[model samples]
Target: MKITVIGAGNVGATTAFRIADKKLARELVLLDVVEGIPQGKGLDMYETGPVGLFDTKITGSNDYADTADSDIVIITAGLPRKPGMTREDLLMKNAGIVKEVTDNIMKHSKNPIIIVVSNPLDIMTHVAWVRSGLPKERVIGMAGVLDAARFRSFIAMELGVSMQDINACVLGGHGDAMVPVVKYTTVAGIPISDLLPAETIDKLVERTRNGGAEIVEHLKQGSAFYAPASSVVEMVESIVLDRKRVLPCAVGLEGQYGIDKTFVGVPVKLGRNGVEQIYEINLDQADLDLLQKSAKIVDENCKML
Candidate 1:
């Protein structure tokens, strides 16, 4: 499989490195709008191919043509939140960026699964889906994957247990609107509520919901790199290998969970063909309300574009 990562910034570059290191693709291309950026980064990673003992044939390019025939495209392009900009403005800006990236990618690759990692993720993913005119499954936003990881991380930390023993999943939108379904969460087959007090679990879940912002708060420069990159790689791996792993990603919803024609994060069966199955997890009335609220916000954000 040939995978192309758009943007050579931290998220894009780090994701590119991990993909090559994991040997998830037969060919890897790092593409950026800035001249010599992708070229420099791509060559540097190309040198690491020997140490990684991977024959991924990594390369860098500024041309969309270089992405031709790609099996998967990971788009990490667009601006991060900065001072002097409202969320409304940022939404418009990133939507335009992702739309252009999707347009260019479609010109080169006809049937590639696009993994969107840009900000206002769900809306931008919706933008990509609209611009590319691909099936709902082919365009996905990276959110719940990272959010769920945060849930597991905090769960592991609070319980002083290994991450391997944790089983959990987060649903809904990407931000505070995210819902960590406590009903399904467990530690080594034991319900989390049994292991920890209700209030304690609530606080921990709140932390998980804000995991991305917590990192941004610490980094005056930008957001997190390691976990986000790792998350992207995991999605790419499942797709490239056709593993059919069930992951939470933001994709179009056509009536499932009462969401219609909008993008939101939910559990999906991912494979070589992208979102193979959309899991309709039974949300209680409370979760259903939260998901409706989250999807409403995403819909509102999409209107800004």
Candidate 2:
């Protein structure tokens, strides 16, 4: 399979590297508006291919023509969030960028799956869906995987356990309104509530909500990339290998959870066809309220755009 990653910034570059490292695609194309940026990065990575024991062909280009006939196109080309700038501030600008990128993707790939990684991700995915006229299953935003990774990492830190042992699902919007379903969280098949104290779990939940900003504040420049890139690779692997992994992701809802005509995070089964199934899990009243609130926030953001 061929995978095209648009943009050679931190997110896009890291995602392309991860995909190549995992051997998820036979050919990896990195495209950027800036001349030579993607080429330099792709060449640097390709030089390590022999030592890394991966033979994936990595190419970089400033032209969209290089992305032709790709099976999956991940759109990560957009302005990064600066301090004091809200995600809404990026809506108008990124909408134009997404429209242009999606048009290019439609012109090149006949039936490609799109994964939107730009900020205000749900809205960008919505834009790609409308602009590309692709099926809902073929267009999704990479939010829940990243959000859940944060939640799971915090749970691991609190319990001093490996992250591999922690299984969690974060649904709803990508920002502050993200809902971490604690009831569904587990450590080695045991509920986290049974493993950690209530207060500690609550603090972890709050920390997870601010995970991205916490890193931003610490670095004082740029946002987190390691986890975010790994999150994208997780989805890419599932789709390329047809793993059918059930995970949470931002997908358009049509009356599910009483939400319609908007993209929000929900549990979905992903495989070669992108989102093959939308899993409806049981939620208590409190979880339901939080999810509804998150849906409202996403709905409001889309309306504003």
Candidate 3:
């Protein structure tokens, strides 16, 4: 399979490297607007192939022409979230960037699946879908998986368990409005709600919502990329290998969970054809209300752009 990652910034470069490490793609293309950035990173990753004993072709390019015929296109090309600025504040600026990037992808790729990792992810994925004129199933955002990872990591840390045993689902927008489904979380097939107190779960949920900002606060210049890149790789592996993994991600809604015409985080089956199915779990009244609130926030942010 061939995969193209747009923007060789922190997120894009790290994601490309992660994909290469996994040997997920036969050919990997890294594109960036800045000259020499992608080339340098691509060379760095290529050099590791011999030491790691993985034979994946890695190429760097400043032209979209090099990305033609890609099976999957990951759009990580946009500005990062800054201190004291909300994702909504980057919406207008990032929308233009997303549009241009999607337009370029559409010009070369035919029937390619898109995974958007830009800021204000829900709206940016929507922007990409509209701009590319691709089907809703072909475009998704990498938010819920990243948010769920944060939630699961906190759970593992709190319980002193391996991260492999902790699994969680985070839904709704990619920002502060994200909802962590403690009711659905599990520790090695055991319900996390039964193990952790409600108050502790509440704290974990709040921390997951602010996960990105916590890193941004410390870095002061750049946003989180390592975990986000790893999350993107998980999604890529699911699609490229047709694993049909039911992972939470930002997907377009068509009356699911009482939300419509917007991209929000939900459990979805990812495979070679992109999102094959969206699974809507039964939510209690309180959880339903929270999801609706988060969807409204995403809708408002999207409409403002």
Candidate 4:
């Protein structure tokens, strides 16, 4: 597969390096609006192949032409959220960046499955979908997987159990409105409610809701990259390998969970065909309410753009 990753910053660069290390793409292109950054990071990642042991040719470029004919393009080109700022605060600016990036991507790569990792993720995915005019399936966003990962880790820390044994279910938007469905969250197939106290679970859910903001607060200048990049690569890996992994990600919804024509987080089957299927799993009335409310917020914000 020929993969192009836009923006050579923390998340984008880390994504490029991980994809190359996994040898998922034959030719990996890292493009950025800024000069030298992509080239420098691309070369740095390329130089590690001998030691990391993967031969996927990694190239960085300022020209979209270099990304021509890409099979999959991951767009991470947007301003990171500053401390005390929310993902919604980055909406208007990131939407513009995502739109232009999607335009250039469509120009170079026909039929590319575009994965958006920009902030205000659900709305940015909508921006790319509208800009590229691709099928909703082709323009997925990275959100729930990262949020779910945070939930899982927090649960692991809380219970002193292996993270591998925990399955966290997080839905809705990528912000404060996100829905952490504790009913479905489990430790070794046991619902968390049976393990942790109700109050403790509430705390974990709140932390998961502010996962990105928490990281931004810690860095004071940058947001989380490792988990976010890994979350994106998980989606990409499913597509590249045709794994059809069931991952929760942001995708345009059409009447599912009482949401229509809005991009929101839900479990989807990711395969070579992009979103092969979107799963509308059972949720408690409370969880469903939060999801629909979150979708409405994203839809309302997207209309302002």
Clashing residue pairs, backbone N/CA/C < 3 A, model 2: none
For model 1, the superposed segments whose C-alpha errors exceed 4 Å read: none
* Clashing residue pairs, backbone N/CA/C < 3 A, model 3: none
- Per-residue CA lDDT of model 2 for 153-260, tens digit only, reads 777767888988888977777556777888889988999888788988888888877788898998899888889888888888898889999988989988878778
Query: TM-score of model 3 relative to the true fold?
Result: 0.95
Q: TM-score of every model?
A: 0.96, 0.95, 0.95, 0.96
Candidate 1 lowest-lDDT run of ten:
296-305
Off by over 4 Å in 4: 83-89
In the range 162-216, model 4's lDDT, one tens digit per residue, is: 9899888888875567888878899889998998899998888888877777887
Predicted structure 2: lDDT:
0.85
Candidate 3, which segments miss by more than 4 Å at Cα? Answer: 84-89
- Looking at candidate 4, the ten consecutive residues that score lowest on lDDT are 79-88
Residue 39 displacement (Å), model 1: 1.2
Q: Write the per-residue lDDT of candidate 1 for residues 67-183, one digit (tens) a residue.
A: 899888888888668756797778777877888888888888988888888887777788888899888878898888888788898988887989888888788766677788998
